[PDB]
Amino acid sequence: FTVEKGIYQTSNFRVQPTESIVRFPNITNLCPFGEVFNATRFASVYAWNRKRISNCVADYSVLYNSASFSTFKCYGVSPTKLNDLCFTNVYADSFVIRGDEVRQIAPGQTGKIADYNYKLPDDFTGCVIAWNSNNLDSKVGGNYNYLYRLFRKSNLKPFERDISTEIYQAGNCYFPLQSYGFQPTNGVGYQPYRVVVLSFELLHAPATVCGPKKSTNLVKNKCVNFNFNGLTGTGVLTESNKKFLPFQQFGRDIADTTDAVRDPQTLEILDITPCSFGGVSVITPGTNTSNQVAVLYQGVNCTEVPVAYSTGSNVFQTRAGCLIGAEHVNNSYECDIPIGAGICASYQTSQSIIAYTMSLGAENSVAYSNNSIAIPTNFTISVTTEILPVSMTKTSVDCTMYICGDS
């Protein structure tokens, strides 16, 4: 509850990041989702296609947000987290089925379609997309161009396609394939319903399919939380005269720390200056002497510390940081409270803390001459004290008791 005269270090100062910026390369190559879904003619259910999708961005900005799809449900992840989840080779399967048979596409479902031409494993994690296409695949005389496996020897395994047209022996000879009666006059549930299923094997190869990576505007001369192509950090970005090679992205100093980065969108080099920080020291005389103090932000500009005693009314930029609360004076005295770089603080007269350049001593000019001598005519017997530590307190510590007392 009382503090002696001196300068004491307290909680450190550090400029907080004003905002967070994210920079990623231009989103150029997108997956052929448009071709996959908006194809003029879709495959049949018994002959469901399998198109491989790889090395592209799978952004669902125009897929999920569109209301054209009447059935959108993913069995492994949410559509909201789909855009920020990296993937691998993507297989797109498209077919047209009856409206009432859309429920059979779910894993662990029954039905002639599910048991004969399209089965999904119970551990399905992809997305199934379906929407009504009555006006697109309905014919007044019956769109018989689409066929479904009506007869088969036994149930088929998931992710299997059957093309054999051999006559099924019921005993009794029936063609395994039957055409759909798609007409514009069909009721809901019997109308044609185009279905596209997004099945992909993941976490078994280098990731070649990834979702969109949004990026924000680039700010400079401000301590921010940057993120350049996954290289996170905090600092002040500033244009630099460093000349990177065309294939180089980051810059590392002699201590293996990032000090220069290249913006993935506009290819320029930005110096990464760390956000300003430093200890906070409080200059004080004794508590009973006075209750006013001066603070020092070591190695910190107070063209900048007001960002964080921000009013000031008494500031002084020194080489050891800048001083707040102490009045700068031209006079030089003996060092009372050391601050650094030859600046000392003292409590003087009304009374206030003064900051000054300390004086090494009184100036003296010896009256030297080649024929002049000074000889003392008197003397003083001087007795001065010298204090020297000789020993300290003996301490014996039982290691076992201290670490594991009684246990």
Partner 1 sequence: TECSNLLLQYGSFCTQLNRALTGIAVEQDKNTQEVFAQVKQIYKTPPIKDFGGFNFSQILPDPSKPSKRSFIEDLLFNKVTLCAQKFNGLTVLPPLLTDEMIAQYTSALLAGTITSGWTFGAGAALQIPFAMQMAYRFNGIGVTQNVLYENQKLIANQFNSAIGKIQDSLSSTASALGKLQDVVNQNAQALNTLVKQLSSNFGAISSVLNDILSRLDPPEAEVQIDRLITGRLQSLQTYVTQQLIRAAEIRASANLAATKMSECVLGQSKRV
Partner 2 sequence: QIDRLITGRLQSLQTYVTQQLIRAAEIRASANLAATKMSECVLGQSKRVDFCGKGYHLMSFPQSAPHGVVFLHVTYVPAQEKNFTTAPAICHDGKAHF
Partner 3 sequence: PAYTNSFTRGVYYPDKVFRSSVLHSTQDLFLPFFSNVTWFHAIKRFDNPVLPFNDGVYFASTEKSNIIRGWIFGTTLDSKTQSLLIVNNATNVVIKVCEFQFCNDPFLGVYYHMESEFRVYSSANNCTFEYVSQPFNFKNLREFVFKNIDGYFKIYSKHTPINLVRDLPQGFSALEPLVDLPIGINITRFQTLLALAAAYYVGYLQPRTFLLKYNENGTITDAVDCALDPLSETKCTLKS
Ligand X SMILES: *[C@@H]1O[C@H](CO)[C@@H](O[C@@H]2O[C@H](CO)[C@@H](O)[C@H](O)[C@H]2NC(C)=O)[C@H](O)[C@H]1NC(C)=O
Ligand Y SMILES: *[C@@H]1O[C@H](CO[C@@H]2O[C@@H](C)[C@@H](O)[C@@H](O)[C@@H]2O)[C@@H](O[C@@H]2O[C@H](CO)[C@@H](O)[C@H](O)[C@H]2NC(C)=O)[C@H](O)[C@H]1NC(C)=O
52 binds, among partner 3, partner 2, ligand X, none (CB under 5 to 8 A by kind): partner 3
3-state secondary structure of 58: coil
Q: In the structure encoding, which two tokens stand for residue 403, read together?
A: 């670490």
Under the binding rule (CB under 6 A), the answer on residue 303 touching ligand X is yes
Residue number with CB closer to partner 2 (243 or 394): 394
CB of 258 to partner 1, least distance (A): 9
CA dist., res. 296 & res. 359, Å (int)? 21
CB of 355 to partner 2, least distance (A): 31
Rounded alpha-carbon distances, angstroms, from residue 346 to 9, 293, 350: 17, 11, 14
Residue number with CB closer to ligand X (68 or 145): 68
Tell me, rounded to whole angstroms, the distance of Cα 97 from its chain centroid.
44
Task: State the number of binding residues for partner 3 (CB under 8 A).
Answer: 21
Under the binding rule (CB under 6 A), the answer on residue 68 touching ligand X is yes
Q: In the structure encoding, which two tokens stand for residue 368, read together?
A: 């030297």
- Are 200 and 126 spatial neighbours (Cβ–Cβ below 8 Å)? yes
385 binds, among partner 2, ligand X, partner 3, none (CB under 5 to 8 A by kind): partner 2
CA dist., res. 252 & res. 50, Å (int)? 46
Enclosing H/E stretch for 355? strand 352-357
CA dist., res. 48 & res. 163, Å (int)? 10
- Nearest residue to 153 (alpha-carbon basis) of 164, 137, 145: 164
Residue number with CB closer to ligand Y (377 or 395): 377
Under the binding rule (CB under 6 A), the answer on residue 349 touching ligand NAG is no
Q: Which of 67, 170, 203, 375 binds partner 1 (CB under 8 A)?
A: 375
Range in contact with partner 1 (rule: CB under 8 A) among 34-42, 168-176, 210-218, 248-256: 248-256
* Radius of gyration, alpha carbons of the chain: 41
- Are 356 and 344 spatial neighbours (Cβ–Cβ below 8 Å)? yes
> What residue number has its CB nearest to ligand Y?
367
Q: Which of 248, 303, 317, 332 binds partner 3 (CB under 8 A)?
A: 248
- Nearest residue to 307 (alpha-carbon basis) of 194, 407, 222, 398: 222
CB of 93 to ligand X, least distance (A): 14
Under the binding rule (CB under 6 A), the answer on residue 375 touching ligand Y is no
Q: What are the residues binding ligand Y (CB under 6 A)?
A: 365, 367
Residues of the shown chain interacting with partner 1 in the complex, contacts defined by CB under 8 A: 9, 12, 232, 235, 253-257, 259, 274, 277-279, 298-299, 319-320, 335, 338-342, 358, 360-376
* Contact set with ligand X (CB under 6 A): 33-34, 37-38, 62-63, 66, 68, 301, 303, 317
